Symmetry: none
Subunit: 22 residues, 3 copies
């Protein structure tokens, strides 16, 4: 459930369709 | 359910259609 | 259901059509 990510770029949490970025 | 992300860029939470960014 | 994101940039919650940004 909870994540507590506080990242700084592209990020899923999870299902189909693998994200893209550059 | 809950996430508590407080990230600072592109982010899904999850389904089809993988996001894009740059 | 609930998310509690308080992020600071592009973000879906999830369905088709992968968002874009820059």
């Amino acid at each position: 459930p909870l994540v507590n990510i506080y990242n700084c770029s592209g990020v899923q949490v999870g299902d189909n369709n693998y994200l893209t970025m550059q």
